[PDB]
C-alpha cells in the first residue's frame, strides 16, 4: 500500500521528473535557485533587523517614571472632581485611565461617579464632545 518510510514517491512527482530527458535536472535546478533566493532574503532581513535592533539601544529605562503606591480613598474633593470631568473629556468611557489619572478613585467609583454627579457636572455633554474627536 505504502512506500518504505522516508522515501517520497507521489504520483504527481514521478511524472514531473520523467516528462523529458533533463526534466529531472531542471526541477532540481529550480529548487537550488529557489533556495539561494530565500537564503539571501534571510541575510537581508537579518541585517535590516540588525539596524532596527540597534536604534532601540538602552530601551526606555531613561524615560520611565516611578510607581505611585497610593492607598485608595473614598471621598471626592473638588480637586479630584475637577480632574475627573477633564479626564472624561479626554478618555471618553475608558474608566481605567480615569482611575489612573485621579489616582485615588477605583473604576467602580469612577463609574459610580458617572451617576452621582451626572447632572451637576453635565457629564452628558462632556461625553458627547469626546465622541466629536
Amino acid at each position: 500500500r505504502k512506500p518504505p518510510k522516508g522515501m517520497f514517491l507521489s504520483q504527481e512527482d514521478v511524472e514531473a521528473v520523467s516528462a523529458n530527458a533533463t526534466a529531472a535536472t531542471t526541477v532540481l535546478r529550480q529548487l537550488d535557485m529557489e533556495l539561494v533566493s530565500v537564503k539571501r532574503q534571510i541575510q537581508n532581513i537579518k541585517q535590516t533587523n540588525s539596524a532596527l535592533k540597534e536604534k532601540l539601544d538602552g530601551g526606555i529605562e531613561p524615560y520611565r517614571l516611578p510607581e505611585v503606591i497610593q492607598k485608595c480613598n473614598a471621598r471626592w474633593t473638588t480637586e479630584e472632581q475637577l480632574l475627573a470631568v477633564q479626564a472624561i473629556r479626554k478618555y471618553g468611557r475608558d474608566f481605567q485611565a480615569i482611575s489612573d489619572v485621579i489616582g485615588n478613585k477605583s473604576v467602580v467609583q469612577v463609574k459610580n461617579f458617572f451617576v452621582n454627579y451626572r447632572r451637576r457636572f453635565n457629564i452628558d455633554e462632556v461625553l458627547q464632545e469626546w465622541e466629536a474627536e
Partner: protein
C-alpha cells in the same frame, strides 16, 4: 521441514497439494475424492523420502512397495504408477547411482544431444537410463560448458560456476551426496575498502547498505503500486527506476530545506514588523516624556487644568511603557524561537560523493548477481524467480566444480571437438551436420529421431548464425531469443606463494572511483585451500575489460591489492588466468537475465519443442523432433547450474514420454 513432508520440500513440491504436472498424469486422482488424493500424496512423499535418504543406489518399484505400509501399499498399481512418474521426471534415480537392474541390452530410439554442459549431461544420463541410444556433440575439448575449472599444480579455481546457492530444496544437494564434493560454507562478512586503500567505517557501511535495500524496495513500489512500467513507449528498466527514485529523494531533501528556511524568513519578518513597531513606540515615548517634563516645570500651585496635564501625561506615558514592555517580552520569544530553528537544520545532502560511491558498490553487486548492467534488467520482472530461492548457506566447491560434470559424463558417448554447424529436422527424423574444431574440413553427419539442443542462449543469439536450423526456427521461438537477455561477467584468478589477506574472511570488496567502473575488479574471493584470490568483473566493466591484455588486468588487481595490504605484502602472482566469456564462441556470454521488455514467460517459450511440417502434404501431423534445454529454458531457476540440470531432467522426461510412451497415465 522434516518427515515425508521434508522430502516434498527438498523436491520443490507442495506436500499437501498436487502439482499441475501431476494433474496431467493422474487426472483420475485429482478429479476424484479428496481421500485418494491424500493417499497419492503420501505415496509420492514416501517414495521421494526413500530416494533422498539414500541416493547412492537405484530405488526400484519393488524396494518402494516393500517399505510402504498399509493401507498405502494396498493398491500396487497406484504405487507402481506413482513410482514410474517419479522415475521418468527425474525426481528419483537421477544423477550417479548404482543400478540394481542393469540396462536393457537393446536400445530404443536414437537422440542427438547438442552440448555437454550440465543440462546436456543430465538429459544424456536420464535418456541412457531409460534405454535410449544417446550421443552428445561438444564443440569444446572438455565437458562442463560454463562449469569450467582451472587446474595446475595444487591450484584449483573455477572460472565459471563457483557457488551452490543453498541446499534447501536444491537438486545439487542430492548430487553432492553422490560425488565427492568438498562443500565449504561461505562466511557472509564482507569488508569494503575505498579506492584510497582503507576500510569503510562500520557506521558508514550500514547506512549505505540499508539505503541500498531501501532503494530496491522503492523501485518495487513504483513497479507494483504506481504501474511505472512504460516510458516513451519503452519498457522501464531497473536502472531507470533507481535513478528516478534517487532523484526523488534528492528532490525531497531540497523541498525540505526550502520549507525550513521559509520558516525562518516568516519568523524574521514577524520580528521585522515588531521591531518597527517598537522603534515607533520608543519615539512617542521620547516626546511624551519631554512633554511631561515640561509640564512638571510649571511649579505649583497650579490651576486644575495644569495639574490635569501632569497627571494625564503621566498616565499616558505609563500606558505606552506598559505596551513597550509587552513587545519586549514578545520580542524575546521570537529571538529565542529563531535560535531553535537555526539550530535544528535538516540534512544538506541526500548522499555525499563518498556515500554515493559506496552505494555504487552495492549496485555492482546486483550487476554481478544478474550479470548485466541494471539499465538492461526489466523493472517489473528482473526478480521474478525470488520465490523459489533455496534455504541455507551458500557454499563453494573447494575441489573444483568441474568434478560434477566430469562425474556425470562417466558412461556416455561424447564426441569432443565436434562443432554442430547445422540442424535438419523433418517429419521422419533429424540429421545434425558437425565439423571438427581442430580441422574444419572434416565433416560429420548424425541421423537421429530427436535432437536435444542445449546451445547457450548467446550462441542461439549469434548473428550471423553459428548454427543453422533447417527449416528455420519459427518466429515465436526466434523472438523469445531476441527478447531475452544474455549477460556477462568475468573472473581474474590470482595465484600466489603465500596468504597475505585475512584468512577468516572469504570475500572483500573494493570501492570504485566512478560510477562507470563500479564493476571493475569490485570484489575478491578467498575460497580455496591453496593461496588463490579471485576477482570479479561485473556490470559494464565486464564487456570492456575483455579488450585489455591479461597483464594490464593483473596489474590493476595488484595495485588494488597493494592499496589494501601495503606494497611489501603483495608478491607477484605465480599463475594468472582471465576469463573472457563474451568472446568465448561456445558461450557468447555468461548467463541469462530477464531483459527489460522480456518476462519469465519467454523462458517457457524457450522450452517448447519444435514439431516439423509433414513431408507429404495431407500426411498426419508429426511428432516433435527438436527439444531445448539449458539454463535459459527453466523459468523458475534460470542462470544457475541447478536450473540447467533441472531442465536436462525435464527434457529427458518429455522425450522419453514421446518416444517410449508413458504407461503411468492410464
Amino acid at each position: 521441514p522434516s518427515g515425508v513432508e521434508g522430502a516434498a520440500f527438498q523436491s520443490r513440491l507442495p506436500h499437501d497439494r498436487m502439482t499441475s504436472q501431476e494433474a496431467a498424469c493422474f487426472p483420475d486422482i485429482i478429479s476424484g475424492p479428496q481421500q485418494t488424493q491424500k493417499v497419492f500424496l503420501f505415496i509420492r512423499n514416501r517414495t521421494l523420502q526413500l530416494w533422498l535418504d539414500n541416493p547412492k543406489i537405484q530405488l526400484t518399484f519393488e524396494a518402494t512397495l516393500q517399505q510402504l505400509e498399509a493401507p498405502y501399499n494396498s493398491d500396487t498399481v497406484l504405487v507402481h504408477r506413482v513410482h514410474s512418474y517419479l522415475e521418468r521426471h527425474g525426481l528419483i534415480n537421477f544423477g550417479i547411482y548404482k543400478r540394481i537392474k542393469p540396462l536393457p541390452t537393446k536400445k530404443t530410439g536414437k537422440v542427438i544431444i547438442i552440448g555437454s554442459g550440465v543440462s546436456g549431461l543430465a538429459a544424456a544420463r536420464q535418456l541412457q537410463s531409460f534405454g535410449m541410444d544417446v550421443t552428445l556433440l561438444e564443440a569444446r575439448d572438455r565437458v562442463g560448458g560454463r562449469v569450467a575449472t582451472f587446474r595446475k599444480g595444487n591450484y584449483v579455481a573455477d572460472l565459471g560456476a563457483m557457488v551452490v546457492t543453498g541446499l534447501g530444496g536444491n537438486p545439487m544437494a542430492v548430487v553432492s551426496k553422490q560425488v565427492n564434493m568438498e562443500l565449504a560454507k561461505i562466511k557472509q562478512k564482507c569488508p569494503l575498502y575505498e579506492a584510497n586503500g582503507q576500510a569503510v567505517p562500520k557506521e558508514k557501511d550500514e547506512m549505505v547498505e540499508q539505503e541500498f535495500n531501501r532503494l530496491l524496495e522503492a523501485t518495487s513500489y513504483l513497479s507494483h503500486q504506481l504501474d511505472f512500467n512504460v516510458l516513451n513507449n519503452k519498457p522501464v528498466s531497473l536502472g531507470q527506476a533507481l535513478e528516478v527514485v534517487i532523484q526523488l529523494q534528492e528532490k525531497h531533501v531540497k523541498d525540505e530545506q526550502i520549507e525550513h528556511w521559509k520558516k525562518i524568513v516568516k519568523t524574521q519578518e514577524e520580528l521585522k514588523e515588531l521591531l518597527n513597531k517598537m522603534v515607533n513606540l520608543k519615539e512617542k515615548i521620547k516626546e511624551l516624556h519631554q512633554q511631561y517634563k515640561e509640564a512638571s516645570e510649571v511649579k505649583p500651585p497650579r490651576d486644575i487644568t495644569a495639574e490635569f496635564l501632569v497627571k494625564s501625561k503621566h498616565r499616558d506615558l505609563t500606558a505606552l511603557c506598559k505596551e513597550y514592555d509587552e513587545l519586549a517580552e514578545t520580542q524575546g520569544k521570537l529571538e529565542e524561537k529563531l535560535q531553535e530553528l537555526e539550530a535544528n537544520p535538516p540534512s544538506d545532502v541526500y548522499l555525499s560523493s563518498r556515500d554515493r560511491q559506496i552505494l555504487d558498490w552495492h549496485f555492482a553487486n546486483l550487476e554481478f548477481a544478474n550479470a548485466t548492467p541494471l539499465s538492461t534488467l526489466s523493472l517489473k520482472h528482473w526478480d521474478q524467480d525470488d520465490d523459489f530461492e533455496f534455504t541455507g548457506s551458500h557454499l563453494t566447491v573447494r575441489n573444483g566444480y568441474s568434478c560434477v560434470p566430469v562425474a556425470l559424463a562417466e558412461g556416455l558417448d561424447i564426441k569432443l571437438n565436434t562443432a554442430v554447424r547445422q540442424v535438419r529436422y523433418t517429419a521422419s527424423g533429424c540429421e545434425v551436420i558437425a565439423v571438427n574444431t581442430r580441422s574444419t574440413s572434416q565433416t560429420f553427419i548424425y541421423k537421429c529421431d530427436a535432437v536435444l539442443c542445449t546451445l547457450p542462449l548467446g550462441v542461439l543469439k549469434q548473428q550471423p548464425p553459428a548454427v543453422q536450423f533447417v527449416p528455420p526456427l519459427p518466429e515465436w521461438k526466434t523472438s523469445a531469443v531476441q527478447r531475452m537477455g544474455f549477460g556477462n561477467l568475468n573472473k581474474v584468478v590470482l595465484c600466489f606463494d603465500r596468504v597475505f589477506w585475512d584468512p577468516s574472511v572469504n570475500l572483500f570488496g573494493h570501492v570504485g572511483s566512478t560510477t562507470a567502473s563500479r564493476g571493475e575488479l569490485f570484489l575478491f574471493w578467498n575460497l580455496y585451500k591453496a593461496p588463490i584470490l579471485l576477482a570479479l568483473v561485473a556490470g559494464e566493466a565486464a564487456g570492456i575489460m575483455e579488450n585489455i591484455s591479461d597483464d594490464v588486468i593483473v596489474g590493476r588487481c595488484l595495485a588494488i591489492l597493494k592499496g589494501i595490504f601495503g606494497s611489501s605484502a603483495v608478491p607477484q602472482p605465480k599463475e594468472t588466468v582471465v576469463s573472457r566469456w563474451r568472446a568465448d564462441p561456445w558461450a557468447r556470454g555468461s548467463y541469462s537475465y530477464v531483459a527489460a521488455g522480456s518476462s519469465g514467460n519467454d523462458y517457457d517459450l524457450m522450452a517448447q519443442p519444435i514439431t516439423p511440417g509433414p513431408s507429404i502434404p495431407g500426411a498426419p501431423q508429426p511428432i516433435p523432433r527438436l527439444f531445448f534445454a539449458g539454463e535459459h529454458t527453466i523459468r523458475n531457476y534460470p542462470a544457475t547450474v541447478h536450473g540447467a540440470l533441472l531442465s536436462g531432467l525435464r527434457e529427458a522426461g518429455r522425450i522419453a514420454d514421446q518416444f517410449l510412451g508413458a504407461m503411468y497415465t492410464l
